[PDB]
Amino acid sequence: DKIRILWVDDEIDLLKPHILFLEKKNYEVTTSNNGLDAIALFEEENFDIVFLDENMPGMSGLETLSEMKEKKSAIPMIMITKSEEEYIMEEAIGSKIADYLIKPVNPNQILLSLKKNLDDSRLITEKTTLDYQKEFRKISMELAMVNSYEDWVELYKKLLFWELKLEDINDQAMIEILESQKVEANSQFGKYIERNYEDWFAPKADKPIQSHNLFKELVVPEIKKKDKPILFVVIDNLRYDQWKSFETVISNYYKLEKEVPYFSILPTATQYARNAIFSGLMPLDMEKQFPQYWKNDVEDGGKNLYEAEFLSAQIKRLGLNIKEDYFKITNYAGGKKLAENFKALKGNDLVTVVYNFVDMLSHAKTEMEVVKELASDDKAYRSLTLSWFKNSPLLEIIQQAQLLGFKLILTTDHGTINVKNPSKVVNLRYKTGRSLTYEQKDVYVVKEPKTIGLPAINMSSSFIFAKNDFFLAYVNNYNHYVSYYKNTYQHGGISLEEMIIPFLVFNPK
Amino acid sequence: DKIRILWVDDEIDLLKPHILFLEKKNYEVTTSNNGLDAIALFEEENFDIVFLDENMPGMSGLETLSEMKEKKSAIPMIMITKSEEEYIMEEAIGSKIADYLIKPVNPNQILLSLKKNLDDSRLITEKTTLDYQKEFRKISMELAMVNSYEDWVELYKKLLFWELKLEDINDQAMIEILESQKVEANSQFGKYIERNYEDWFAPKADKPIQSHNLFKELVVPEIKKKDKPILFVVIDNLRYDQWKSFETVISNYYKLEKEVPYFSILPTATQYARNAIFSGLMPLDMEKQFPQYWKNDVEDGGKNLYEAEFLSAQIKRLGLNIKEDYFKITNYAGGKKLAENFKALKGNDLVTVVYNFVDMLSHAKTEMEVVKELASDDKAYRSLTLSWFKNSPLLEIIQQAQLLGFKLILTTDHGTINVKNPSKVVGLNLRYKTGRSLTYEQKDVYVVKEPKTIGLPAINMSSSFIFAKNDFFLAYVNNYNHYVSYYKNTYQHGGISLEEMIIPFLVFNPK
Ligand SMILES: [Br-]
Ligand SMILES: [Br-]
Ligand SMILES: [Br-]
Ligand SMILES: [Br-]
Ligand SMILES: [Br-]
Ligand SMILES: [Br-]
Ligand SMILES: [Br-]
Ligand SMILES: [Br-]
Ligand SMILES: [Br-]
Ligand SMILES: [Br-]
Ligand SMILES: [Br-]
Ligand SMILES: [Br-]
Ligand SMILES: [Br-]
Ligand SMILES: [Br-]
Ligand SMILES: [Br-]
Ligand SMILES: [Br-]
Ligand SMILES: [Br-]
Ligand SMILES: [Br-]
Ligand SMILES: [Br-]
Ligand SMILES: [Br-]
Ligand SMILES: [Br-]
Ligand SMILES: [Br-]
Ligand SMILES: [Br-]
Ligand SMILES: [Ca+2]
Ligand SMILES: [Ca+2]
Ligand SMILES: [Ca+2]
Ligand SMILES: [Ca+2]
Ligand SMILES: [Ca+2]
Ligand SMILES: [Ca+2]
């Protein structure tokens, strides 16, 4: 079927050369010399695109466009006109024109416009697929040369870039090559963490910023500027690719000043990593210095009940002079309440908000059929996250902060990974106990938890952390475990997805 | 701050007129005569936009664009070139060029391109705001004059048009004016239905197409064309504005041929409206002719178990000779199974698929908190619907149908409305009730004490139906305050509103 063009111009007779040109290229052109007759044709037929002149004796192009868009708002409209006035450009852009071509127009300019507005999705698919075909071997060589935490950050950024570009391609071979590069990257990263993690605790060790350093190394310098009040947001369980998915939404309100990828401590779980952010201490030092607040895995109830108390203690230890408030948002109603009353906080130096909803979406993928239909794969997960963020009380809180001239600091405690591969053992990405059987190739084994700043019941206590996209399955119910936990979002172990996470500073626009 | 343009061309000397033109207009132009140096400038400085020539002795425009997009993918890239190289327009479009201007270029064509790529958001917001300021009074006058079901369809289309444009706007005053017009429209529509609905059942009545007419009046003509096999999709509970939210997604696969608004029967609920689609009979006639299949509200278990049987019987009654199959998808796994095995249906004349949306009314507090975070208001609801459609097995089924050359028919049984105002009932979270001893606020509901007159069943002559008007929800007196706090701002159906009742029927040809 030929592409059907409706061309409205009072001088459509003088445009015969253009018409013959497009008919040679397999376009069907229907001509009209006035807006009113063009509207009648547009109502009766299903054109693929309309060309409009601006200056016509009866209805103008923009008047014709208004009527046509009201009737069928999905059909692309191009203005083709002698008018060079900026006010007409702005009126046409503001009316959602697809393109605006100034006469005299090269017939190939029109052809470009037809291809760009009707065939761009297929052309982007074809071009992206061939770009990755020509790039993927270079990405395998770059992966092979990684030999520092900074190279790991750079390589992760490269994989995220290609993951987002390839998400809608059709070529399964190329899709599986990207999936094989992600598996190899996580396998190498797993080995890197296993070999370096304990050494990173040595005096004057060369190490990335981690959970227990985050507040002192990256938040306090922004506080000491005393330039604007700071809204410090921890979005629980946010992956780097989720941050990338709503980067352009945020930029409507906030201009990115600084981006520091940083490393979650082990295990990559709220009770350890998120408490470490707020305390500025490793879990073992939280147990030693704050026994009234620190809870081990075995103890009852909430594991992050005391973040305000950890934070106030850390602020005092650092000798800061600030007015500071902490909020934990656990549902829509709480978020909406804080958004509507945020102005109360205008005289704070620091407002800290923990927002738990993504964590809720991440285990809702397995448990609620609603979220399961909405988040079947990583593309669907980022899509649902973006829809969430754009319509969330959290973005209303951020817009309120913007109007009050707050600096925005946005971060997370850890990410999550879509687990594929069972690993037998006697949380599905770390386990702690005094008797444990495991596949040693699959896990990072820590026989002496105190050497990596974790608590131990006794000298027999071990930690086990899953690597790659492994999930720790009990032998007891192995087949049912595999069937239930396959393709779910888990955290606690080692992967780029769980461990390398954004720290972002923005100025209000 | 001036807009910062990076212009990469090996003959930036020949472009001086363009640069002076743009500098007069408050643009700051930084020139570079080769890709390598341009990349270094792009890394060090913060450009708003980049202009690239394709044909250069070193790195090409497209090679330069690849390096720059990798570093800062948000910055628009415009190609300004003359080339004789084959397929360069296609290669540049596929590389996500923002625009492609063929030399020699009118300097005003470049200026257009700058405004379109950097100012379009702000200009659409300003124009939408000013146009609605000029339009809203006209919409109030039109609402005042509505006096036919056809006028109601036209007014609804106008409100939908403006609702979609205004959703991303700053001006609270204009947002509240639109919200007040929607409230008034539903109030008047409620009175209109209350006055006219019973007359629509008279012999030879003037009435819109309804649930029980849909298959015979709108689907059979497409079947009798005997042109292509038909995929007939009923999306459960779909609003007009939800169809609008994914219209441009489905156009990648299917070209819209015909769009007919039609009217759900009362109640606007699956058990009545959706069974009527498949049976071609009103619920009362389903009870009379198919007592083995029809279930009343009082009976246990599924209310839509027999749609395949109702449809096969209707097809036989109409004397159609077709190979036809029915599928009801109630979860991800079912949808994925049908998408992955759709080619098995290649020899069918008709494939009917019921595709359930997400449950908007969970009895579990934790699940309702998730739905409210994702769909607190109409904009959030359309956003979630678009994310759903783009990532659903339903779109995979539609793409499979397209590759087999199926015609697509897309419709729904009824919409849903965001409920705001409690209305007490005595004697299910839907906007209708049926009972023999109902207490209700009569001002809030359309009351039908003779259900058989509107093709509904009655247990006995004490049986009544009540249908909520406006944005009312029917609240139980038992635990009233907790009920109100839970169901406030939820998407419900069963009653009278433009959202529940006036719904799309769409016919598409495969691309
Ligand atoms: Br029309
Ligand atoms: Br004129
Ligand atoms: Br005219
Ligand atoms: Br021309
Ligand atoms: Br590799
Ligand atoms: Br591994
Ligand atoms: Br550090
Ligand atoms: Br907690
Ligand atoms: Br301070
Ligand atoms: Br609050
Ligand atoms: Br809010
Ligand atoms: Br070069
Ligand atoms: Br890109
Ligand atoms: Br030129
Ligand atoms: Br007027
Ligand atoms: Br009004
Ligand atoms: Br009819
Ligand atoms: Br059912
Ligand atoms: Br037939
Ligand atoms: Br809530
Ligand atoms: Br009766
Ligand atoms: Br009654
Ligand atoms: Br009650
Ligand atoms: Ca003219
Ligand atoms: Ca967490
Ligand atoms: Ca050149
Ligand atoms: Ca080329
Ligand atoms: Ca329904
Ligand atoms: Ca009665």
Q: What is the residue extent of each domain of chain B?
A: 3-118, 121-196, 209-415+500-510, 421-493
B267 in Cβ contact with B465 (< 8 Å): yes
| Rounded (10°) CA dihedral A455, A460, A461, A466 | 140
Neighbours of ion ligand 7 (CB under 5 A): A 209, 213
Residue A32: C-alpha distances to residues A17, A49, A76, A192, B288 (Å): 16, 14, 17, 68, 56
Mutation target among A374, A379, A390 for the B interface, most CBs of B within 10 A: A374
Residue A359: C-alpha distances to residues A21, A251, A363, A416 (Å): 57, 24, 7, 9
The experimental method, as deposited, was X-ray
* Nearest CB to A127; choose among B91, B126, B164: B91
Collect all residues with Cβ–Cβ distance below 8 Å to A219 and sequence separation of at least 6. A230, A232, A409
Kindly state the helix (H) or strand (E) to which residue B143 belongs, with its residue range.
helix B120-145
Residue with token string 């769409």? B506
Contact pairs from chain A to chain B, CB under 8 Å: 166
What would the two tokens of residue A470 be?
């492994």
Spell out the CATH class of A211-418+498-508.
Answer: alpha beta
Instruction: Render the burial of A78-109: b for 16+ CB within 10 Å, e for the rest.
Output: bbbbebeeeebbbbbbbbbbbbbbbeebbbeb
Distance from CA of B62 to the nearest CA of A (A): 11
* Cα angle B149-B150-B153, degrees, rounded to a multiple of 5: 90
* Nearest CB to B256; choose among A46, A360, A369: A46
Q: Do B369 and A94 touch (CB under 8 A)?
A: no
Instruction: Render the burial of B40-75: b for 16+ CB within 10 Å, e for the rest.
Output: ebbeeeebbbbbbbbebeebbbbbbbbebbeeeeeb
For residue B81, list its beta bridge partners: B102
Overall resolution, Å? 2.1
B403 touches chain A (CB under 8 A): no
Distance from CA of A192 to the nearest CA of B (A): 26
Residue A378: C-alpha distances to residues A160, A168, A179, A183, B385 (Å): 12, 12, 12, 15, 18
Kindly report the length of chain B. 511
Instruction: Tell how far the Cα of B506 is from the centroid of ligand 26, in angstroms.
Output: 49
A119 touches chain B (CB under 8 A): yes
Sequence letter at residue A326: Y
| B267 prior amide bond cis, ω within 30 | yes
B53 is in an annotated binding site: yes
Q: Are A3-118 and A211-418+498-508 equal in CATH topology?
A: no
Distance from CA of A398 to the nearest CA of B (A): 15
Find, among A331, A355, A358, the residue nearest to A240 by Cα.
Answer: A358
Which three-class secondary structure state does DSSP give residue B6?
strand
Collect all residues with Cβ–Cβ distance below 8 Å to A463 and sequence separation of at least 6. A266, A267, A430, A431, A432, A445, A446, A449, A452, A454
Residue B454: C-alpha distances to residues B106, B282, B428, B436, B447 (Å): 66, 8, 22, 17, 12
Distance from CA of B157 to the nearest CA of A (A): 9
Q: Where are the alpha helices (DSSP H) in A217-302?
A: 220-224, 240-250, 270-279, 283-289
Distance of alpha carbon B2 from alpha carbon A493, whole angstroms: 48
Distance of alpha carbon B244 from alpha carbon B379, whole angstroms: 12
Find, among B371, B352, B427, the residue nearest to A331 by Cα.
Answer: B371
Collect all residues with Cβ–Cβ distance below 8 Å to B409 and sequence separation of at least 6. B219, B222, B230, B231, B232, B233, B505, B506, B507, B508
Find, among B104, B102, B42, B32, the residue nearest to B76 by Cα.
Answer: B42
A384 touches chain B (CB under 8 A): yes
Collect all residues with Cβ–Cβ distance below 8 Å to B367 and sequence separation of at least 6. A368, A370, B359
Chain B CB contacts of A103 under 8 Å are: none
Distance of alpha carbon B503 from alpha carbon B414, whole angstroms: 6
What would the two tokens of residue B3 be?
């807009």
Find, among A373, A369, A363, the residue nearest to A419 by Cα.
Answer: A363
Could you tell me how far CA B244 lies from the centroid of its own chain? 3
Q: Relative to the alpha carbon of B451, which ligand is closest?
A: 21
A101 touches chain B (CB under 8 A): yes
Chain B CB contacts of A248 under 8 Å are: 74
Collect all residues with Cβ–Cβ distance below 8 Å to B137 and sequence separation of at least 6. none
Spell out the CATH class of B3-118.
Answer: alpha beta
Could you tell me how far CA A87 lies from the centroid of its own chain? 37
What would the two tokens of residue B204 be?
């030879």
Chain B CB contacts of A116 under 8 Å are: 93, 97, 99-100
Angle between helices B16-24 and B107-118 (to 10 degrees): 50
Q: Where are the alpha helices (DSSP H) in A322-374?
A: 332-340, 357-367, 369-374
How much helix, strand and coil, in percent to the nearest 5, is found in chain B?
Answer: 50, 20, 35
Distance of alpha carbon A275 from alpha carbon A411, whole angstroms: 14
Sequence letter at residue A425: V
Q: Do A374 and B387 touch (CB under 8 A)?
A: yes
Q: Please state whether beta strands B464-468 and B432-435 pair in parallel, antiparallel, or not at all (unpaired).
A: antiparallel
For A161, the closest chain B residue by CA position comes to: B70
For B112, the closest chain A residue by CA position comes to: A89
Distance from CA of A367 to the nearest CA of B (A): 10
Residue with token string 């969970």? B362
Find, among B32, B37, B41, the residue nearest to B9 by Cα.
Answer: B32
Residue A395: C-alpha distances to residues A388, A399, A408, A410, B476 (Å): 10, 6, 12, 12, 35
For B396, the closest chain A residue by CA position comes to: A170
Collect all residues with Cβ–Cβ distance below 8 Å to B111 and sequence separation of at least 6. A86, A89, B21, B22, B25
Mutation target among B68, B123, B403 for the A interface, most CBs of A within 10 A: B123
Strand residue runs (E) in B415-498: 417-418, 421-425, 432-435, 445-448, 464-468, 472-476, 491-492
DSSP code per residue over A416-469 = -EE--EEEEE---SEEEESS--B-TTTEEEES-GGGGT---SSTT-EEEEE-TT
* H helices, E strands: number in chain A: 21, 20
Sequence letter at residue B131: D
